[PDB]
Amino acid sequence: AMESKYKEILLLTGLDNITDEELDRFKGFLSDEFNIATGKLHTANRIQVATLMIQNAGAVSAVMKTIRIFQKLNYMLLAKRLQEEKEKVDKQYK
Amino acid sequence: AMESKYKEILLLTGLDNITDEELDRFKGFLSDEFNIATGKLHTANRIQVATLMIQNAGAVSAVMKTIRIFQKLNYMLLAKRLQEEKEKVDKQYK
Amino acid sequence: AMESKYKEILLLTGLDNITDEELDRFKGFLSDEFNIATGKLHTANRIQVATLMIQNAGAVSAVMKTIRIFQKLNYMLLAKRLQEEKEKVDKQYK
Amino acid sequence: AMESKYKEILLLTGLDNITDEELDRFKGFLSDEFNIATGKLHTANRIQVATLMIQNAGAVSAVMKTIRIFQKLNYMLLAKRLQEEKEKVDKQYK
Amino acid sequence: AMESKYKEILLLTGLDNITDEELDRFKGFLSDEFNIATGKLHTANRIQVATLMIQNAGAVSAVMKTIRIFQKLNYMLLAKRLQEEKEKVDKQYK
Amino acid sequence: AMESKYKEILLLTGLDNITDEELDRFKGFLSDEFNIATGKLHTANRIQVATLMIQNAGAVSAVMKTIRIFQKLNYMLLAKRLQEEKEKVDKQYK
Amino acid sequence: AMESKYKEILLLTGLDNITDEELDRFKGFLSDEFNIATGKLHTANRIQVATLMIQNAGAVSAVMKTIRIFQKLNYMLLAKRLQEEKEKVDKQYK
Amino acid sequence: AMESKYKEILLLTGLDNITDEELDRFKGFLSDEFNIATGKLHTANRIQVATLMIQNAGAVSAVMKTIRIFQKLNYMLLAKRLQEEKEKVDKQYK
Amino acid sequence: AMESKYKEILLLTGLDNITDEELDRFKGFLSDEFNIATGKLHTANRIQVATLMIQNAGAVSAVMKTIRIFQKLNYMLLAKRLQEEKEKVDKQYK
Amino acid sequence: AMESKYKEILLLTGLDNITDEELDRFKGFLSDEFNIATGKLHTANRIQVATLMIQNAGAVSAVMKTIRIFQKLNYMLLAKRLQEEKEKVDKQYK
Amino acid sequence: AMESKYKEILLLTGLDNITDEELDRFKGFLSDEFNIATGKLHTANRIQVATLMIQNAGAVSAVMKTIRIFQKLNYMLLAKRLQEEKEKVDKQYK
Amino acid sequence: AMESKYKEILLLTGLDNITDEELDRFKGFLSDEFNIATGKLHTANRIQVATLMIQNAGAVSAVMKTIRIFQKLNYMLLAKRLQEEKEKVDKQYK
């Protein structure tokens, strides 16, 4: 399904690549896109964080907000690639 | 009957999906909608809890209060879906 | 009831925000306000700890002692806010 | 029987070797091969998980889907070995 | 009776204080004082363990052996206190 | 919110620019504006230091004290700019 | 109690001030005052180390030995202050 | 019994002294003396690991293999001491 | 890949040869080709600097801008050689 | 087994000798022999890195690729020795 | 506080003015006023040296000894000024 | 104990005095007295190096070899003093 495929993008192409130090910076500017919380985020395995994000918004808004953040944290090289892969999947369901 | 159908919603679409940890949190904020009790709730198999809830209020008030709680515990993704399915069944008997 | 409302304050505004490391420090200076115990406290889910505290003192003394501790552990930012919310609820029942 | 032998493969050669962390990753990409569920899977002893898988599909489809997953989660070293052992048992009943 | 009082010592002053991790270590060096057993001990609620100990030796030998163990597992702070309380009760019946 | 915007100023315009050697000098003259401490400050990632500062004073007093320090450590070029950006945000909420 | 007050001294006036590097040096000359151990000490959060020290000696001997060590590791500035605060508390119970 | 005494050697003189990092290295070269396994060993409290070792070989072969490993991992200082203590106990039963 | 080969050029033929003093001069005229920053650049191991450059522009624009800078800092002897090697690799993929 | 012996070569003769700085350089030219990844490699204890390498290729291809890399990073002194030791073990199984 | 003000004198009026060559000469005649050491002093940033001096003597004896040294190393022009500023601060607390 | 006293000599009279540059020279001529290793020594805090030396030889052979090295690296001024202090401690236990 489109859902499973989006998740594979998030996990395999996204988190299975990104580092840590940067995740700490991401957390410092978080809460600006999702109605999550503080102390609550501090130690949550990538899988847990992705799951909590989806349990709230979804594979639609979560992906969009991720794209938006990737553009803020300077991360443009990985933001362009995600945008391209997104469009590739969209074409399959247009 | 409308009753049996509501029960199928509760059990198959509701409890047959939700986790545990969250049930503990539900219990911690319970007693706010139903005239049930304490120590009495601690270990009651989903089937027992649903049955006790209905034996008191019913398939009308129990479902309404469940909808209301699902909106409190942040659980909105599963609350919207329940609300949609509810309306679908209501249309059949309007 | 005033009781349920106080609990919502404790849980949603208090524990649903505070971290862990600090909870360990809290435990190290505990037993100074409540007639609880040792080894007994080591691993007790926030819900369990709140419940045990109330089962002993109550929503009156437990809240007061929490306010007092929040002022000791330097935690003043969250102590002022709790004090303000407390006064807001008190006004409703004055 | 072929059934008991397949189970011995699954349990002794498979699960009696694989780690945990990876099981969490497996769970995150599950539900893609079996008509099982969520929250339902979270804590199920290897024996319980194998049994539920078989109770649904069987020793035929469950083994095939396991082989397929072992190839996805990069796990190729253990996937080749399982494929070899499978062929060895197939020869005995050809 | 002297028996009930000794039990109150064991339970309230002893077990109602001691932790877990240490209980595992106690179990690892057990069977050296009581003619109990293995696998049999692994999961036995403090109340069950105390009861089985007494059902064998009694409130006389069980207490003496507990005192002796408390001195081995380094636990001297709690061993001195138990010895003092013991002497206090002995004086009442001398 | 005004809070998030102030934080973006602090982090992106402030710390994401300033060097290290100078941070050591800042630390040597610190404790003069905030009720923090010693040895406690020695190794705290910019994100940690900003967070601890806010957890005490806030986005109001922390920013004001930062402005004041930036004027002491000769740092005037970056102090004027911060003051200008501050006034720009203030105008939006006047 | 005198105990709680001594602990506040140890933690707030002592450890909440001292650095790390020096703690490593302390550990290198430890075992000379307490019947503790090696490898066992290597990574123990200040709270854990204080607790283990007390669980053995107490708030009487642990404080005395700390005073003595503070005088050895050259640390005299913090040793005089601790001695003064100690005498201040002693006067309250003389 | 000789068994209990050997266990006291293993636990008190051995594991109650050795560190962690080195245990990870031990695990990396394990499986070379005992017919145990992988993933299975990763997280097993010293008590659990000792027990599993004995449940397989015993207090005779387990001790001998431990002595042998202690000589490989360079650990000679602790290997000589264990060998001496072993001989001391052997003399008691010669 | 062309990417890996370009990196080998940068690192082995470029940085593994150039000195320091000159790197300081390079830094003084930097920020003119890449959207990087200040204080941020001061101490970044050649590997870190190359990686940050690529993480922004890439192996295409980073190499081109390097060529351009090598021509400015008078460095022509090493600029001609880089240009020749570049053309040699281009021919392989024309 | 040949496997265990190869591992002893890798760990004791290889990694237990090589430095760090050079490991960073190795990482910069990695991914050219193994189908591993980025950010994923950044902080992985020698034991973890060896294990991941083997979990993919094995003690056959991993050793061969290591030999090949040791010849690239100029490291010839340690490459000749590894090649000699390899041949010595091969002779034992020819 | 008087302490902070003395530090500002030391750092801003003292070290933020004095050169290097002379610091080497100061070091050559040091150890005559403070119970510090050798090799230990060789490379210690002004901030580190001031801090170590205070950590030993204090803002009282350290300042007095500095005044005394400033009079020895011929440095009289800066010694008179320091003495004047000292008296000015003393008057504020007389 | 004689051991602790020897360690105090090593650390306080030895390492707490010696410089760095010379430590690099020591390392270059090391491995000639102890069965240690290379790359392994490069960055090991004085405390770590002393501990590893003792973990191998001891406070007897390590001290003797240190004395011997101190005589080689020309260091005679500190070698005579160590020899004198050694004899002073020996007299106490003759």
Residue numbers in the entry:
A (entry chain G), B (entry chain B), C (entry chain E), D (entry chain D), E (entry chain C), F (entry chain J), ...: 0 to 93
Can you provide the manuscript's text about this entry?
AIM2 contains an N-terminal PYD and a C-terminal dsDNA-binding HIN domain. For the AIM2 inflammasome, upon binding of the HIN domain to dsDNA, the AIM2PYD domain clusters to nucleate the formation of ASCPYD filaments. The AIM2PYD filaments in turn act as the platforms to nucleate ASCPYD filaments, resulting in inflammasome assembly and caspase-1 activation.
The symmetry that was found, a rise of 6.0 Å and a right-handed rotation of 138.9° per subunit, generated a reconstruction where the PYD was seen to be largely α-helical. In the filament, AIM2PYD forms the core while the GFP tag packs tightly outside. Estimation of resolutions by Fourier shell correlation between the densities and the fitted molecules gave ~5.0 Å for the AIM2PYD region and ~11 Å if GFP is included. While the GFP-AIM2PYD filament has the symmetry of a right-handed 1-start helix with 138.9° rotation and 6.0 Å axial rise per subunit, the sequential intrastrand subunits do not make direct molecular contact. If we sequentially label the AIM2PYD subunits according to the helical operator, the three types of interactions that dictate helical assembly in the AIM2PYD filament will be between the first (i) and the fourth (i+3) subunits for the type I contacts, between the first (i) and the sixth (i+5) subunits for the type II contacts, and between the first (i) and the third (i+2) for the type III contacts. In the AIM2PYD filament structure, the type I interaction is formed by Ser3, Lys6, Leu10, Leu11, Asp15 and Ile46 of the α1/α4 helixes of one subunit and Arg24, Phe27, Phe28 and Asp31 of the α2-α3 region of an adjacent subunit. Gln54 and Asn55 at the end of the α4 helix interact with Asn73, Tyr74 and Leu76 in between α5-α6 of an adjacent molecule to form the type II contacts. Type III interactions are mediated by Gly38 and Lys39 of α3 and the nearby Asp15, Asn16 and Ile17 residues of another subunit.
